[PDB]
Amino acid sequence: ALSLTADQMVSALLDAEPPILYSEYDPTRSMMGLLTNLADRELVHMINWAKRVPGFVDLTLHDQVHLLESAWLEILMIGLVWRSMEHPGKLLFAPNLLLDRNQGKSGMVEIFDMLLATSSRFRMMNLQGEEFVCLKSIILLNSGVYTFTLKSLEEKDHIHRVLDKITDTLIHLMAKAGLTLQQQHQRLAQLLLILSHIRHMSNKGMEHLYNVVPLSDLLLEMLDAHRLH
Amino acid sequence: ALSLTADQMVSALLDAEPPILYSEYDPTRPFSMMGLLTNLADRELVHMINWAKRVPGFVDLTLHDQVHLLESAWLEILMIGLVWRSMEHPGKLLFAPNLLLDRNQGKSVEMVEIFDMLLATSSRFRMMNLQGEEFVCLKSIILLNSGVYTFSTLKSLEEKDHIHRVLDKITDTLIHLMAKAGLTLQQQHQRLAQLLLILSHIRHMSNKGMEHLYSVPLSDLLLEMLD
Ligand SMILES: Oc1ccc2c(c1)CC[C@H](c1ccccc1)[C@@H]2c1ccc(OCCN2CCCC2)cc1
Numbered sequence: 001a002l003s004l005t006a007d008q009m010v011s012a013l014l015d016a017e018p019p020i021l022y023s024e025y026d027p028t029r030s031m032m033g034l035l036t037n038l039a040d041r042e043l044v045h046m047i048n049w050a051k052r053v054p055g056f057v058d059l060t061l062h063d064q065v066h067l068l069e070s071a072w073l074e075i076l077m078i079g080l081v082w083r084s085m086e087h088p089g090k091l092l093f094a095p096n097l098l099l100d101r102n103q104g105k106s107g108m109v110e111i112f113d114m115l116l117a118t119s120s121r122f123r124m125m126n127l128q129g130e131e132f133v134c135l136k137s138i139i140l141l142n143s144g145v146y147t148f149t150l151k152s153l154e155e156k157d158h159i160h161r162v163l164d165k166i167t168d169t170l171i172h173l174m175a176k177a178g179l180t181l182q183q184q185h186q187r188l189a190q191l192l193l194i195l196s197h198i199r200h201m202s203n204k205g206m207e208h209l210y211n212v213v214p215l216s217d218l219l220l221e222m223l224d225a226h227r228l229h
Numbered sequence: 230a231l232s233l234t235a236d237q238m239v240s241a242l243l244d245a246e247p248p249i250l251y252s253e254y255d256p257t258r259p260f261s262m263m264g265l266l267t268n269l270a271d272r273e274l275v276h277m278i279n280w281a282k283r284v285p286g287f288v289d290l291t292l293h294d295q296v297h298l299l300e301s302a303w304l305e306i307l308m309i310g311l312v313w314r315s316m317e318h319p320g321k322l323l324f325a326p327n328l329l330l331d332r333n334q335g336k337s338v339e340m341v342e343i344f345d346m347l348l349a350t351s352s353r354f355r356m357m358n359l360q361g362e363e364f365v366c367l368k369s370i371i372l373l374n375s376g377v378y379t380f381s382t383l384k385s386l387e388e389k390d391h392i393h394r395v396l397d398k399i400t401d402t403l404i405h406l407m408a409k410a411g412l413t414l415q416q417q418h419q420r421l422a423q424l425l426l427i428l429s430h431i432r433h434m435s436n437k438g439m440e441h442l443y444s445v446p447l448s449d450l451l452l453e454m455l456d
Pocket residue numbers: 035036037038039040042043073076077079080093108205206208209215
């Protein structure tokens with residue numbers, strides 16, 4: 001995990017990429033319901049992706065749950081934003097569900113505009129796929145690391161070590177891209193600062209989503225899988 | 230501002246530093262916490278505007294954009310200042326030199342949630358051995374970055390460009406401070422990343438804090454003070 005190279009980190013992350021799911025509705029024939037159903041089906045695939053992120057399965061089950069519980073919406077959003085890059089003014093929730101801002105207006109066209117603005121920023125920066133997977137992995141490991149005993153000290157230290165490896169990977173990606181050393185840390189800073197805005201969008205999103213099993217135990221169930229398959 | 234060297238950026242930032250204010254309560258009478266915190270924050274905000282106008286490149290922006298940036302960042306700025314002066318006080322938050330509270334004093338009203346988050350941030354700074362030169366850079370970054378994604382006119386395009394160019398200068402400054410600290414190129418980029426990722430948590434704390442306060446528009450008060 002901590003012994004991988006930069007290119008091995010990239011190859012591991014890309015291969016771990018979840019598939020693009022479709023909205024469940026009749027194309028031969030309500031928006032929140034569609035987005036909710038889409039989000040829930042994506043969460044299942046997100047857990048599989050998370051377990052394939054180098055260093056994540058090295059953590060305790062409790063800490064895995066905590067990290068995903070903190071980051072799951074940010075992860076959905078940055079994925080959505082990535083999907084929507086070459087669709088200006090629109091959000092590609094699914095290949096059969098492409099929406100403009102005046103569609104999402106029918107009470108949160110607010111985060112719609114915020115997601116669009118993020119996509120435009122990624123389009124302005126010419127974000128690459130190898131950079132995207134790095135950023136998404138960073139969100140997974142970092143979003144909940146500040147909100148967690150001897151075990152916790154080792155866990156947090158391990159997390160920060162993996163984050164450092166991803167940072168080195170990002171630098172390597174930009175160094176190979178021909179960027180000067182100054183352009184490297186500048187682009188690094190620009191990419192990470194965007195994560196603060198994605199955190200912001202998640203907060204506003206969760207403010208809207210807020211009997212049912214608490215999300216932690218659902219995450220617990222999907223993460224704590226046996227070895228019989 | 231874009232012509233400033235790294236050391237000139239630091240000295241300018243350090244000079245622009247706001248004063249540490251005191252809680253307005255009488256120490257001679259016995260010991261409402263939120264009121265004390267609210268009063269302190271409002272007095273700090275006035276000084277924050279002075280600090281903001283002395284951050285390189287900020288006055289180069291339109292009044293409207295200055296208001297937008299501050300309205301988005303003001304709570305984050307108050308918070309990172311809080312955890313900075315609380316860094317040498319483990320398990321406690323130094324709101325003011327005469328107002329030092331532990332986490333049990335946080336249960337005042339149905340806020341200890343934000344308290345623990347602030348405490349956790351201060352311990353993270355303490356473990357990283359955050360330097361004063363780094364602190365002022367990060368705080369300036371919050372000011373310029375927090376609201377830059379929530380502004381399409383020709384004017385606004387030039388505004389966003391300038392902001393991102395100043396942000397780059399702060400990034401250059403941070404690396405220069407780490408390189409002058411004796412850190413290798415690998416460690417420089419790693420520490421840069423660690424510091425900026427903390428800002429995501431500060432944004433998080435701000436949002437949680439705003440949710441508390443939400444339960445005379447600020448832009449008008451900011452506009453009044455900025456002009
Ligand atoms: O690729 C994606 C699929 C669906 C979405 C998004 C990305 C971006 C946020 C959207 C959003 C809409 C309204 C409010 C907040 C965010 C929507 C979305 C809809 C519903 C959601 O929550 C469903 C509840 N469900 C319970 C456990 C996990 C989620 C999350 C995201």
